[PDB]
Amino acid sequence: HGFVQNIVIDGKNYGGYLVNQYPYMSNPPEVIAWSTTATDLGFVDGTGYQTPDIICHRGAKPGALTAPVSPGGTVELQWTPWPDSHHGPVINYLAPCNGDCSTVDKTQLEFFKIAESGLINDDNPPGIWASDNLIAANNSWTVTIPTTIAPGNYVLRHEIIALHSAQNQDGAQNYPQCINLQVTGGGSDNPAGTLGTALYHDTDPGILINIYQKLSSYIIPGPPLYT
Ligand SMILES: *[C@@H]1O[C@H](CO)[C@@H](O)[C@H](O)[C@H]1NC(C)=O
Ligand SMILES: [Cu+2]
């Protein structure tokens, strides 16, 4: 359980969607982060993979604001303290807004994977995962925006998948957090995109899995990494 509290881009903080404050306020502030109704600081499980909730979390609506990123620049997402128990991958996707991200129809967004990290070491099951790298970095993740993509406005869909309960059907816990970016530079790729509701299926090999046994491999879920 947790959420993205802050985003650091080009030397400033863009406050996140503080899901334990703003839903209680009813004139809440404009941010680059999508609003959600996930006030339990919880997840979307396999029962919601083909519902709109998987796209940018439960009841999500676009952020009003968009943050510019320098070409090949970094976006640092700062989480609330991630529990060690919640082992799993950290995955990052972009989807083009083709206009102002604040007015997009999330159900039409087509995402391409720009980064993925999974099982890092398995010397002591359940092992060390991307989520453990995030904890070791004091609960932050650095995303590098590719220089090869067409610039414009994009949703960044940043996600941890916790696998501590994933040996049961619908046990994997997805924690997507979306932010609005203005990608800048000289690139031209328009990578093939995947609807939010086709990223994951509740029987995928990196989703329905017992992490407590020795693992020979881990197949990071979602569509193929763009390079
Ligand atoms: C996180 O930062 C705090 C100090 O702000 C430190 O006490 C803690 O050990 C840090 N680093 C790691 C690797 O967790
Ligand atoms: Cu949790």
Side-chain angles (χ1 to χ4, degrees):
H1 284 60
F3 63 96
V4 168
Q5 279 207 299
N6 186 55
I7 304 98
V8 187
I9 305 170
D10 292 315
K12 57 169 288 173
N13 289 347
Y14 289 89
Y17 188 78
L18 306 182
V19 72
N20 62 354
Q21 286 195 70
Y22 297 165
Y24 303 97
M25 274 183 193
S26 316
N27 54 352
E30 288 187 335
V31 289
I32 70 171
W34 290 41
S35 61
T36 83
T37 66
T39 58
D40 69 343
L41 317 194
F43 54 82
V44 181
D45 71 23
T47 72
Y49 291 175
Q50 282 66 233
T51 73
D53 289 337
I54 192 56
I55 300 165
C56 288
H57 216 317
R58 278 185 257 124
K61 297 187 187 239
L65 307 182
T66 302
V69 186
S70 61
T74 59
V75 173
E76 181 190 349
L77 303 103
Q78 298 181 333
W79 288 76
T80 58
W82 191 252
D84 299 292
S85 65
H86 283 45
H87 297 293
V90 176
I91 313 174
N92 288 281
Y93 302 87
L94 293 173
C97 294
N98 293 309
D100 188 341
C101 291
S102 70
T103 64
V104 299
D105 177 351
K106 67 181 183 183
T107 68
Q108 299 193 308
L109 289 172
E110 286 193 330
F111 294 93
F112 57 91
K113 184 179 281 172
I114 60 161
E116 64 176 357
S117 182
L119 176 65
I120 312 297
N121 179 269
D122 203 45
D123 292 353
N124 290 284
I128 298 163
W129 296 71
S131 60
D132 304 290
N133 289 178
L134 180 144
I135 292 167
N138 297 100
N139 307 114
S140 74
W141 199 266
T142 297
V143 179
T144 302
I145 303 308
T147 61
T148 53
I149 62 170
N153 301 323
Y154 288 82
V155 176
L156 173 69
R157 181 180 180 287
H158 172 68
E159 184 179 37
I160 311 173
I161 310 180
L163 296 179
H164 58 282
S165 288
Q167 77 185 253
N168 308 302
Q169 190 60 70
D170 304 319
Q173 295 175 4
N174 293 232
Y175 298 87
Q177 296 283 270
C178 291
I179 71 176
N180 297 333
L181 304 178
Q182 174 185 45
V183 171
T184 72
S188 57
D189 290 349
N190 292 295
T194 297
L195 292 165
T197 53
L199 292 180
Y200 307 117
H201 303 77
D202 68 357
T203 66
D204 289 343
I207 294 290
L208 177 61
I209 187 172
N210 182 351
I211 69 170
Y212 300 100
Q213 300 175 322
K214 192 71 199 50
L215 295 169
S216 31
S217 55
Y218 178 72
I219 302 180
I220 300 168
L225 179 63
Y226 161 75
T227 60

